[PDB]
């Protein structure tokens, strides 16, 4: 279905509030009529400013703490403070912009693998979440890269960390201690956007 | 009514092109599907540009050469090139600012009142015309002022000319030359911005 009852604004905007959000229309042609609207943050953040039914907002917005507002819309006779028709419900969007980086879920991965073990044997699996919008181009797409120890072990980009060599010998070495990094397909890099990962090797 | 099935777009915007008009919605789906949109000036002036269905615009725009597009939009699977909506008509409505002055077009006006009428007696009526939206914050309000000739006739907001004084004698002065200067209520006057009123008493 077309879904029209909709506005959208951009989260984060830097220029000088306040900031455009949409318009409310009505067919109704009493020009003693006003906008009026109730909801989430209604009157607050967002405010008509009028007498044409443009929305503003009247704080900067992260998406990441509030992702969308239901509202209602009405307009009123002023006069007789009558309703004009029926109220109408709808939905202001905050559109995502790409402000966060991929943070590891553990500070510390541990796995382990046996020691001479075919070349691209799995290890283990390591996991960064992106806090931004997964249906948008690429924002909360994550790669993963080993930074320290990419001689031995490898990384796909769904963090599952493969052996790089087929003669990893446990006398040797019986641990290594890896570094890896993540980073959103756009770039967006980090800390909390590494993480250590300790690779036992089982005799 | 609520109209929802709308986008609007600031005509005359200075800032670099290209200029966001809104955001096509469906809630279909793929994962595969494109918004492409048909109608006035679409694709040329009207893109949308991926993959959330935002349209922008690719030239400014003049509400008094055009005021409103209608299109309609599509929601295209890309593998088979299989519609997954039926289309849905929408208007991107261009918003109005005031650009325009009012602009006297006849310059000379005649009129004529009895000799020794009583002040406030009505004379004739002028007329200046801005190209503004009229339904729009004041952008089409004319209003006028007398800058020669004050002491013997006023003029209204409406372009009504007065008597300003009871003692217009025919024997002393029979014709007035007055100068009426129109500008809208915001204040923007230009080019074509006064008219000349020949006034003549009679009896
Ligand atoms: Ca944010
Ligand atoms: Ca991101
Ligand atoms: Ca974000
Ligand atoms: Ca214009
Ligand atoms: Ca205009
Ligand atoms: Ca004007």
Redesign the interface.
């Given at each position: 279905?077309?879904?029209?009852?909709?506005m959208?604004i951009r989260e984060e905007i830097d220029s000088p509030l306040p900031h455009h959000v949409?318009?409310?229309?009505?067919?109704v042609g009493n020009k003693n009529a006003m906008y009026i609207i109730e909801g989430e943050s209604a009157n607050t953040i967002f405010k008509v400013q009028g007498?044409?039914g443009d929305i503003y907002a009247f704080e900067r917005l992260d998406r990441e703490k509030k992702a969308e507002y239901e509202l209602t819309?009405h307009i009123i006779d002023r006069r007789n403070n009558r309703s004009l028709?029926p109220p109408?419900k709808?939905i202001i969007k905050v559109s995502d912009i790409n402000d966060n980086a991929p943070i590891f879920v553990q500070k510390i991965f541990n796995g382990s693998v046996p020691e001479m073990s075919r070349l691209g044997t799995s290890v283990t699996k390591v996991t960064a979440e992106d806090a931004d919008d997964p249906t948008?181009?690429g924002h909360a797409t994550v790669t993963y890269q080993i930074i320290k120890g990419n001689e031995y072990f490898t990384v796909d980009d769904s963090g599952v960390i493969f052996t790089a060599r087929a003669d990893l010998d446990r006398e040797s070495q019986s641990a290594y201690e890896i570094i890896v990094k993540a980073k959103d397909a756009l770039g967006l890099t980090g800390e909390s956007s590494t993480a250590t990962v300790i690779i036992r090797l089982t005799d």
């Open positions: 279905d077309w879904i029209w009852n909709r959208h949409g318009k409310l229309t009505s067919s007498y044409d819309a028709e109408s709808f948008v181009a």
